[PDB]
Ligand SMILES: *[C@@H]1O[C@H](CO)[C@@H](O)[C@H](O)[C@H]1NC(C)=O
């Protein structure tokens with residue numbers, strides 16, 4: 001009768017940057033989604049593959065607990081078959097993605113007057129992202145026809161930008177915290193069913 | 196790689212950096228505006244200087260992209276906006292001299308004072324002494340003294356400064372691949388690279404002249420009417436055939452004829468439409484006014500104001516300790532941060548200006564998806580025209596009856612309509628000749644058609660020819676009367692006030708062609724009409740991403756500025772004036788002067 005640790009993830013003091021989005025592997029416990037199914041302390045919940053209307057009777061192999069914080073208007077980009085800044089340079093979801101996504105406003109926490117330069121996201125990239133890939137590179141992006149020599153100059157840019165979150169943005173620019181619960185199931189006994 | 200690909204990333208970086216810096220500068224300016232303290236001034240100066248330095252450095256960096264090898268219209272427009280040299284092409288000594296000249300001219304204009312002899316202490320500034328004297332006093336001698344004293348105690352400090360400013364600006368414009376500074380200003384309407392929607396920089400003068408020529412008869416009739424009323428006001432000072440003296444046109448410079456309304460009421464037995472009493476009676480505050488404005492804008496399909504607008508904006512004078520400027524303004528800080536700053540009062544004028552500022556906010560909100568360099572109106576006349584069309588729509592008696600503010604027993608008759616159209620014409624018609632005349636004089640002075648030793652001699656010639664305004668006191672060449680105006684001495688373009696006055700009347704009727712209006716054009720209202728709202732939003736959402744000819748065509752179906760809808764609007768007053776002018780003479784003689 002082990003409860004999966006869903007309580008300590010949602011109310012953490014801080015989440016990492018967009019390009020350093022946090023992952024947690026959860027197995028061998030019991031997870032009950034009926035706690036948040038009919039409580040409504042969040043703002044947005046939507047998902048694909050599994051119907052939330054009492055489908056926890058099935059068995060899954062592992063649970064991924066992806067978590068990060070982004071801009072509000074970019075919450076649309078966390079979805080299968082989507083293209084954009086986040087969907088090309090930060091985080092790309094599979095076309096047949098199965099799992100749930102919960103997004104809620106975090107203006108009272110992540111917004112500071114005169115900016116909150118603590119959240120980073122990639123702006124320029126040399127290619128696109130394969131599904132479920134990580135980017136922790138700090139290499140200078142080359143846009144011109146000359147070597148960058150490791151310094152910012154003509155046609156040489158730093159690929160990371162910081163959100164300047166301040167409590168006077170519009171709803172689109174205000175910080176939104178996103179948690180993606182992915183139910184990974186393969187050929188396995190799949191002890192993580194969540195009765 | 197391709198040069199456009201080398202420029203796309205540069206534009207992306209510039210956008211992502213300029214958004215934050217512009218937000219910082221705007222926030223600092225807003226903090227100064229809502230709270231006047233020394234630390235606020237220092238912070239705003241620091242933020243503005245940082246933003247300006249970043250802009251100049253980015254422009255210098257961008258000047259290295261060859262525009263001749265780029266074909267995408269949006270990228271070409273953005274890089275053309277970012278590649279301007281500005282005044283940096285001028286030499287450092289010349290640039291410092293120009294900045295000193297501009298600062299001195301502004302300081303002289305905004306600091307000088309006027310007082311009669313034997314009163315060296317009690318000397319009045321421009322406001323609230325000169326403006327109130329001009330707009331309220333009916334004494335001929337006092338008005339003449341105030342006019343001549345303001346024009347003689349200021350123009351002397353402006354004439355040599357203005358000559359040096361003209362020389363420096365002309366050489367700066369010539370050094371930047373322009374014929375002259377007038378061409379630099381006309382370059383705002385220039386369109387190139389688009390097939391079938393092109394515009395030449397020299398076509399603006401031709402279009403303005405054509406429009407004024409076809410406007411002329413209405414202005415002649417209105418001038419005859421105003422002249423007859425003024426002659427009845429002054430029994431032995433205005434000739435039945437002469438022009439109008441410049442010191443009798445309401446305000447200091449005669450830009451607007453609004454203050455003449457009290458002397459030109461057609462039917463004085465019927466009071467104007469003043470609804471201040473109904474505003475006060477029903478316990479109505481600023482919040483209620485803005486909710487009504489929001490409902491009016493919602494009724495046509497445009498979105499509503501967000502929560503941030505309600506939380507952050509300042510819709511009431513703070514009073515107590517805080518000191519704030521009360522000039523209404525719609526602030527767009529960016530990143531979904533919209534505000535309105537105004538000292539609301541319970542008056543119909545505030546009711547209309549609330550709709551004006553809310554239209555400004557809606558138009559700013561419309562193109563928020565465009566890149567940073569294209570987040571402005573198509574040209575310098577669209578934005579205020581969109582502002583004014585909302586007030587025109589909301590000022591009709593039908594709308595005021597649709598909000599439960601007037602008694603249903605009130606029935607509109609022809610007398611009230613004549614009064615309303617005359618009041619509108621005393622502001623709309625009475626400023627087009629002045630705007631066109633001043634812009635023409637400045638254009639041809641920059642071009643060099645007028646030698647310096649003849650400047651004033653030409654300036655007052657058009658006053659006799661175009662505007663039909665005569666000089667009360669003879670003037671020598673040493674005077675610099677045109678420089679006494681606000682815009683000319685602060686290096687401001689002054690033609691935007693012309694095209695706007697036409698553009699709005701093209702939009703209005705177009706929207707009324709989707710509202711299925713039946714009857715005259717002076718009573719049309721776009722409320723409760725989704726088609727008109729969609730048609731307007733189609734133009735608003737484009738911003739500066741397209742040539743203004745396409746934006747105009749997307750609404751009115753025409754590819755050029757036109758004035759026929761203005762005459763269609765003023766047809767009833769035109770017919771009334773034609774009927775009333777059976778005995779009065781239309782026209783004026785230039786050689787007539789009050790002092791002979
Ligand atoms: C205005 O500024 C002063 C000093 O800068 C400060 O003490 C005061 O709290 C400010 N007012 C508001 C409403 O923030």
Ligand SMILES: *[C@@H]1O[C@H](CO)[C@@H](O)[C@H](O)[C@H]1NC(C)=O
Nearest residue numbers: 199203266267268269270271
């Ligand atoms: C310019 O590039 C944009 C890509 O953002 C494209 O949508 C547009 O069609 C292009 N226009 C031209 C004229 O190349």
Ligand SMILES: *[C@@H]1O[C@H](CO)[C@@H](O)[C@H](O)[C@H]1NC(C)=O
Nearest residue numbers: 258278279280283284285371
């Ligand atoms: C002015 O702009 C042109 C290109 O628009 C550029 O070649 C020139 O260097 C600029 N002037 C200065 C002084 O940099």
Ligand SMILES: *[C@@H]1O[C@H](CO)[C@@H](O)[C@H](O)[C@H]1NC(C)=O
Nearest residue numbers: 493497498499500501502505
């Ligand atoms: C603005 O209009 C939308 C309609 O989509 C509505 O949902 C929202 O509640 C409105 N805003 C307010 C403050 O009522």
Ligand SMILES: [Zn+2]
Nearest residue numbers: 551555579582
């Ligand atoms: Zn305005």
